[PDB]
Amino acid sequence: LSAEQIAVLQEQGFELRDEGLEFGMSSKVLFGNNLDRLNPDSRNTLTKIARALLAVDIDKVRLEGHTDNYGDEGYNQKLSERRAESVAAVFREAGMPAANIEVRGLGMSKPVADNKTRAGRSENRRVAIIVPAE
Amino acid sequence: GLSAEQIAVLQEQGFELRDEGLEFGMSSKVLFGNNLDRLNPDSRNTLTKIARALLAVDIDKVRLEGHTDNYGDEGYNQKLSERRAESVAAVFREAGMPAANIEVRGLGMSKPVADNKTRAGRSENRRVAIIVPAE
């Protein structure tokens, strides 16, 4: 729960939540037309975030993958896992140990917008980077 | 338009003789593991190393061909195979090869190198081929 860490997190773009601090990127930004391969630029943005967080000795990051509710529920479950794993590999490659990374795929079960509209579904397809408080 | 010094490097990189070119093949199991089109870190490094070796001897053209087995939707499979050959292309672009010198094809299920009757014959069919043509 340290204090100086927040200044980096916020400067990294994290926002405040109950569990801790969270930063989100849409799957459109992260992967474009790919399945779970990150596009080079997003990988670089992520690498920079991973290194800023390591630098202030963050204890844990949790990566949570999400989809909208369009398509097979099981495939969407697995796709959200693989996409959160792609973000997690960026953290490992930047030097964070596996033991300090948790990965979850949520599928369609934790939406942040209305799946009625094409834009709401694009919002719901995302990976969240969470720094828990405890 | 191909040289002996180019051959020496292709061989030690693991390329083999084929019609009108040289080819290096890896299974989707080794390149991607459990992933969709993201390469495992160790296979990405292996591919980077090959790409550097071919750029060093100024390889003018590379073609990348993605294949699947026959299980599941033929449409998804062709998309999958295209996306997985594109994953290999991006390694070659990052290592310095121009986009113009790279040709990416997903052949889906259409060109199998094993039977597909067996789980092992299917895994073999899941693959990407790195083709250095002669002309």
Pairing of strands B62-67, B102-106: parallel
Q: Is A128 helix (H, G, I), strand (E, B) or coil?
A: strand
* Residue A13 phi, psi (nearest 5): 105, 0
Q: Which of B135, B57, B54, B126 is nearest to B91 (CA)?
A: B54
Q: How far apart are CA A7 and CA B43, in angstroms?
A: 37
**Is residue B133 a contact partner of residue B94, using CB atoms and an 8 Å limit?**
no
Residue type at B13 in one-letter notation: Q
Q: Say which DSSP state A106 is in.
A: -
Q: How far apart are CA B126 and CA A110, in angstroms?
A: 34
Residue-by-residue DSSP string for B72-90: S-HHHHHHHHHHHHHHHHH
For the record, the structure tokens of B41 come out as 């870190």
Residue from B34, B37, B40, B43 whose CB has the most chain A CBs within 10 Å, to mutate: B37
Which strands, in side-by-side order, build the sheet including A61-66? A15-16, A20-26, A126-132, A61-66, A101-105
Closest CA to B60 of B127, B128, B10, B129: B10
B115 touches chain A (CB under 8 A): no
Q: Which residues of B50-62 are buried (b: 16+ CB within 10 A; e: fewer)?
A: bbebbbeeebebb
Q: Which long-range contacts (CB under 8 A, 24 or more apart) does A79-85 make?
A: A79/A35, A79/A36, A79/A105, A79/B36, A80/A105, A80/A106, A80/A107, A81/A105, A82/A35, A82/A36, A82/B34, A82/B35, A82/B36, A82/B38, A83/A27, A83/A30, A83/A31, A83/A36, A83/A127, A84/A127, A85/A36, A85/B35
Contact between A23 and A14 under an 8 Å Cβ cutoff? The reply is: yes
Burial class (CB in 10 A: 0-12, 13-18, 19+), B70: middle
Q: Which CATH class, in words, describes the domain spanning A1-134?
A: alpha beta
Residues of chain A contacting residue B38, judged by C-beta atoms under 8 Å apart: 34-38, 82, 86, 89
Single-letter code of the amino acid located at A117: T
Q: Rounded distance, CA A80 to CA A65, Å? A: 4
Instruction: Look up residue A123 and give its two tokens.
Output: 């919002």
Flag if A37 and B34 touch (Cβ within 8 Å).
no
B36–A37 CB contact, under 8 Å: yes
At A97, which amino acid appears?
A: P
Nearest one of A76, A58, A55 to A66, comparing CA atoms: A76
Amino acid identity of A83? R
- Cβ of A86 within 8 Å of Cβ of B37? The answer is no
d(CA A87, CA A69): 21
Does A68 reach chain B within 8 Å, measured CB to CB? Answer: no
Per-domain boundaries in chain A:
1-134
A20 in Cβ contact with A133 (< 8 Å) = yes
- Give me the residue label for tokens 């405040």: A16
Q: Are residues B68 and B126 in contact, defined by beta-carbon separation less than 8 angstroms?
A: yes
The DSSP letter of residue B65 is E
Phi/psi region, residue A88 (left: phi>0; alpha: psi -120 to 50; beta: rest), is alpha
CATH assignment, B1-135: 3.30.1330.60
Query: Is the CB of A9 inside 8 Å of chain B's CB atoms?
Result: no
Chain-centroid distance, C-alpha B88: 6
B37 vs A37, A85, A92: nearest CB: A37
Check if the beta carbon of residue A26 is closer than 8 Å to that of residue A131. no
Which residue type does A4 have?
Answer: E
Phi, psi of A30 (to 5 degrees): -65, -50
Interface test with B, best of A36, A44, A90 (most B CBs within 10 A): A36
Q: Which residue has the tokens 């529920």?
A: A73
Q: What is the C-alpha separation between B69 and A86, in angstroms, rounded?
A: 24
What is the stated resolution of the deposited model, in angstroms? 2.2
* CA dist., res. B84 & res. B86, Å (int): 5
CA distance readout (Å), A114 to A53, A68, A73, A74, A121: 32, 9, 17, 20, 7
From CA B128, how far away is CA B27, in angstroms rounded? 7
